[PDB]
Amino acid sequence: KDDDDKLDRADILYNIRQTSRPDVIPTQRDRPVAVSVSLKFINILEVNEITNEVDVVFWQQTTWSDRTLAWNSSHSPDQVSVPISSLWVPDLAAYNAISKPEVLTPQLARVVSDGEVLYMPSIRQRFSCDVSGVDTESGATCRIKIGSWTHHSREISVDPTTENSDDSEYFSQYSRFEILDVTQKKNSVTPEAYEDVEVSLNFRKKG
Amino acid sequence: DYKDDDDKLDRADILYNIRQTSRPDVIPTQRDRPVAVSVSLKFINILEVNEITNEVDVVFWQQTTWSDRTLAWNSSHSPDQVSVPISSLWVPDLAAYNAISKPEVLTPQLARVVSDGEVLYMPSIRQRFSCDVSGVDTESGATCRIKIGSWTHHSREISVDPTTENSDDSEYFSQYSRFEILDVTQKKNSVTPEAYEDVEVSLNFRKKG
Amino acid sequence: DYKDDDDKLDRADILYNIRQTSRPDVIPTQRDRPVAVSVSLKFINILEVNEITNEVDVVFWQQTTWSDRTLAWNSSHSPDQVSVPISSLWVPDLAAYNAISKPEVLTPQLARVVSDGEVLYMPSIRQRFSCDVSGVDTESGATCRIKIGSWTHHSREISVDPTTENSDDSEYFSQYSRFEILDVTQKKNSVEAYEDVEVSLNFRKKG
Amino acid sequence: DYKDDDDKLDRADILYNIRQTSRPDVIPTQRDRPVAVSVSLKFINILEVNEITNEVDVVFWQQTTWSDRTLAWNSSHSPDQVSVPISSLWVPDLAAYNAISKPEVLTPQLARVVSDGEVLYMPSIRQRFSCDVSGVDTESGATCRIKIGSWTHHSREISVDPTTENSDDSEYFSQYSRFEILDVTQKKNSVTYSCCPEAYEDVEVSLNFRKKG
Amino acid sequence: DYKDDDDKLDRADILYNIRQTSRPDVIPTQRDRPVAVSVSLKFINILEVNEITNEVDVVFWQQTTWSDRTLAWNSSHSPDQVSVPISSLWVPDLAAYNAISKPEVLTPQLARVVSDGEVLYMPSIRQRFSCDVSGVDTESGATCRIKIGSWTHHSREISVDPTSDDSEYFSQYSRFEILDVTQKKNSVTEAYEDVEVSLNFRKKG
């Protein structure tokens, strides 16, 4: 489009930085922020069948909308890159995580003109999950829950992205492991409930 | 009230109010009474136990609550609670006497402030400890004791009191651990110029068999 | 010119000028053409190679140049170039897709800004990758392919150019490494599109 | 006095006064005398002793006290002392000469300031050292010597001294450690040099320990 | 003069003067001539050595000095030197060409500034290098060569210059012992000045 007008872009960043409240949930019309999450698996590095611990690399594709960040893009760029400190991101956490997320990519989000925000960092992290079955035909099934840490369902709703296929599409052919199946469903932990996305990852050692 | 809880402007004003009254470095001491801090550990995972060196590597949710009345607001027609970055608030300077590594916070550092002045902060922590691991293979199991207390504030300034005194822990403990939990007991204890209050947390566990 | 290179106050003023003009978070897109970024990997060392898990641990110099002509100045009687802290300038958000650890930067985070608007940033980096190491014992060696692109900017926004392939490397590679380089190959490639430079390192053990 | 310790507005106002007087980067030399810094190490654990490479990994409470009287206030009806983030205070630049890892601080970084201008900062620290490890498995035990002094300030500027209570630390150290401690001594020492024409004061700490059996 | 070293207000004011005139991000070239930086490595310990992978883990005090005359003051009745956080000061962007890990700094990061404009910064560093360890178990030992110079400033802008067996500082408890340390100038190619430090050392026993 006009995507390459430096001044247009600098002005958009300015508008965003002035409207954006990095610490307040972008609720609209008094309804929960609808965040969407999807893990896209990239690698499985170490698996310990005795301790039941896995070390994985995945794209943590996250999206939501903040309509106040929107702008007329008839003759201005349709989207820009924004550093995540200038923005609100949802406070996601892996319930069965046993190491800090190690973010391997630049910490930038895209804000689209309609007001949609997308953050997709590439993350390496260790989890605690059922590893039993990893050396058989039918493999192991390790389950990861990603939800809001401090915000309950009425404040934030965490759903899976429309597309869960291609989940294993960018998975490294040089892993000692192979993905048999991935499912990504809604779930709610528990007076207040926290929504999360349960990722079931069915994988096996390459025989 | 629930009706007005997702009003963004209201949420932003509460954040502003709190950042104005909040003294992150001063204890929220009230009426010349010690700040009463409730600490409760909910164990999530036991990862690496060593029977020789007597060390363990645990993961627990540190449920911490206390009250700052001065952060209170009316809450009838605004949401009662909000998330606040903890750098904006006073949090107690708890430490574990027998920790042998830094606590690794695995969750976003956010507290919840309630309209009545109550502050709730519950990080997930992975930390190593020095404690009694002997008898871990045996049916009745090792009993590792963790002592968590205020680090610079003596007992006339901060009091620590544990909210759940006994349980199985069944709710939160990973079913995929090598270990099982028999009992968790938490007692208010004390150690002394002046006095420091703590919570002795006794984790009774054994290797599954 | 070269004779006024060491004039201290002339340097202070260029820095000041740069800091007043530079927009560290906006792509320096000139004349509605995507920022053309030059990348060259110049291998220094291979530290550890794992044939079981197919991970490799490498030390390289990431030679990176691009142009921001709004940063240019008249050097008739002032220095030709200066060093700027990387926080004062915009920097391409490059990422390695098959990276499995955070890029550990071994050098000072200083760039060079040339009086014509050229920015040169070349950090020394250590980083682990997941790549095909089968054959590293073998005389014809293994070939590890590292794919580096801009993480958030598509092709109309940022374009990657790699020079030169395959000419390096024998110049900077450690003679004391257990490994030796047979060849290096740096090629353009793409995937709206994300341009990237695929680097192919042909190496083998010594015997 | 002690009956006003939980006066919040007093504590807050004392913090205000301290942050206004305090020069975090300037040594608190009163009356052209060196700052008298007291250090004492109180050992909590020994975790890894490497017989091959002569390395120890230890956990100790590094007890540090000094005086800065400009920060002093009246104790007449404000709290005797308060806690302060160390970024608000000057802290002496202690280093261990035989440290081979960075100091890993296990505790909150708050110091205590007393109404008479006394400042105490006691972090729990886990750190690796390079010292003689031979004997660890014998009756007599190994003896590792740790020197802690000021890195940049010479003896005219800062004096480093051991503390009046020097039994410590024997009692605290965990009963669960593989090791046990035979003796601890903390003697004042003073290294001079060809590098620099001035003398750096320090405390030499001698830790005598053996494996249990 | 020493007499007034411990005047606190004199100290605070010197530090105020330094921070007011110091330009942390600009080379203190004087009189159209390159900054002359003094570098000397003082070996303290050698921890891990791998003759197979040719890798070495060392601890050394890095002595670094240079001049910025604009920092000079009149010390007639004030302190001769004071300590300054390096974030208030320009420091040379030195890098080890053959290093394979970040320099882990173990000491507090302060410089000393002398009333005549001399700046001394000497941090203790544990770093790992990629160097020839062949022949370490032998009586003549390995010779490991480390190369340090300005990472972004060519010769025209910064010169580095050397200034032993390091018996003074080296650990008696190291598995290893030092035969000889030599420090010589070298250039690499516009060109960069560096100091080659050659460490010659063997196993003990």
Ligand SMILES: CCCCCCCCNc1cc(-c2ccc(OC)cc2)nc(N)n1
């Ligand atoms: C059956 C699901 C397995 C996962 C175990 C979760 C049990 C407890 N559920 C919670 C509690 C909180 C929580 C965190 C912090 C608070 O205060 C800051 C309050 C609640 N947050 C989430 N996402 N799940």
Ligand SMILES: CCCCCCCCNc1cc(-c2ccc(OC)cc2)nc(N)n1
């Ligand atoms: C036996 C001799 C060993 C010498 C081998 C090293 C050759 C590499 N040359 C360089 C390049 C740069 C450099 C760094 C950054 C730039 O732009 C940001 C430009 C050049 N800096 C130095 N000190 N040596």
Ligand SMILES: CCCCCCCCNc1cc(-c2ccc(OC)cc2)nc(N)n1
């Ligand atoms: C034939 C070899 C394929 C290997 C690489 C596969 C390319 C995958 N696609 C993407 C997506 C994004 C992306 C990143 C962040 C976003 O939002 C913040 C959106 C897209 N960025 C890049 N460079 N490639």
Ligand SMILES: CCCCCCCCNc1cc(-c2ccc(OC)cc2)nc(N)n1
């Ligand atoms: C295994 C360890 C043996 C090492 C022996 C220790 C010798 C003591 N020498 C010094 C020098 C300096 C010093 C530091 C920086 C300077 O300028 C910035 C000058 C001197 N500071 C102290 N505390 N001890």
Ligand SMILES: CCCCCCCCNc1cc(-c2ccc(OC)cc2)nc(N)n1
């Ligand atoms: C292996 C575990 C050993 C446990 C022994 C318990 C001894 C209690 N000692 C202290 C000292 C301080 C303390 C810390 C810092 C100070 O000044 C900054 C003052 C006192 N605080 C507490 N809660 N207990």
Ligand SMILES: *[C@@H]1O[C@H](CO)[C@@H](O)[C@H](O)[C@H]1NC(C)=O
């Ligand atoms: C935005 O601005 C254009 C240009 O004037 C205008 O025609 C258009 O109606 C606006 N777009 C929307 C969706 O309102």
Ligand SMILES: *[C@@H]1O[C@H](CO)[C@@H](O)[C@H](O)[C@H]1NC(C)=O
């Ligand atoms: C606000 O709070 C007070 C309680 O102090 C209550 O009387 C009042 O009705 C509430 N009304 C509001 C804010 O509408």
Ligand SMILES: *[C@@H]1O[C@H](CO)[C@@H](O)[C@H](O)[C@H]1NC(C)=O
């Ligand atoms: C650059 O500056 C010099 C010296 O003033 C001048 O002679 C020359 O014409 C200038 N060039 C431009 C493009 O301004």
Ligand SMILES: *[C@@H]1O[C@H](CO)[C@@H](O)[C@H](O)[C@H]1NC(C)=O
């Ligand atoms: C402290 O204030 C009291 C009154 O509470 C006064 O009597 C006393 O003289 C004061 N002391 C100092 C140090 O000024």
Ligand SMILES: *[C@@H]1O[C@H](CO)[C@@H](O)[C@H](O)[C@H]1NC(C)=O
């Ligand atoms: C500063 O130093 C010069 C040295 O010649 C001397 O003339 C002058 O009196 C000094 N100033 C002070 C503070 O006395």
